[PDB]
Write a protein that binds this DNA or RNA. Structure first.
Ligand SMILES: [Zn+2]
Ligand SMILES: [Zn+2]
Ligand SMILES: [Zn+2]
Ligand SMILES: [Zn+2]
Ligand SMILES: [Zn+2]
Ligand SMILES: [Zn+2]
Ligand SMILES: [Zn+2]
Length: 171
DNA sequence: CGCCCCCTGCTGGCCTCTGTGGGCAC
DNA sequence: GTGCCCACAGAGGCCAGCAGGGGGCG
């Protein structure tokens, strides 16, 4: 198994150097200071990855369109979202919107489905909401009131006689 | 050990669509 | 009096940038 177990959490690794990193995450030690700005890193490669920002080095080139990127994960996501079909996307568990990247789903969850302690009143009635999505859905539902729907086309109407005359435009 | 990769997660400008209110016609 | 036309402010996913842990391997 993993003999080098951590004392402050439930982490364990088969290498003592890996436990040195994890224990360094608890203490917050940063034994690698950047010689340019005030940034300090816990790992060696993280500092070298930071030096790309000062030197402008972009060692990852999309083999399709030949754009360059600083980190490899950036290039992978680029290729996945720009040059690839049938990519699995994320569905929000609270609404129907589909979001491509996982981090953008988290931004959606915090902006649309977080509880707002200070309620906001609907701009059309006295209804008050503590969630942005419920508030927006309610205000958009005010447009549906006193509006006759559409069977085939996308035409909306407010008068029963005008919609009954619009139905005759199909026959 | 360090190097390179992976996934993660937040950031802020960008791209692109929405709806909405004022203006003119049976 | 209602039913379109169009500018325009807002909105939100899209996107590259940037560090955060963590494993395989020379
Ligand atoms: Zn720990
Ligand atoms: Zn620096
Ligand atoms: Zn590309
Ligand atoms: Zn949602
Ligand atoms: Zn919170
Ligand atoms: Zn309302
Ligand atoms: Zn119709």
């Amino acid at each position: 198994e993993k003999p080098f177990k951590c004392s402050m959490c439930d982490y364990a690794s088969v290498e003592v150097s890996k436990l040195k990193r994890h224990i360094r995450s608890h203490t917050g030690e940063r034994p690698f200071q950047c010689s340019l700005c005030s940034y300090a890193s816990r790992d060696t490669y993280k500092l070298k990855r930071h030096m790309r920002t000062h030197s402008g080095e972009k060692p990852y080139e999309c083999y399709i369109c030949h754009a360059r990127f600083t980190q490899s994960g950036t290039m992978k996501m680029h290729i996945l979202q720009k040059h690839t079909e049938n990519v699995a996307k994320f569905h929000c568990p609270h609404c129907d919107t589909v979001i491509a990247r996982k981090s953008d789903l988290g931004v959606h969850l915090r902006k649309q489905h977080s509880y707002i302690e200070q309620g906001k009143k609907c701009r059309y009635c006295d209804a008050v909401f503590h969630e942005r999505y419920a508030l927006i859905q309610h205000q958009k539902s005010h447009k549906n009131e006193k509006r006759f729907k559409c069977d085939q086309c996308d035409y909306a109407c407010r008068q029963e006689r005008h919609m009954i005359m619009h139905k005759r435009t199909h026959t």
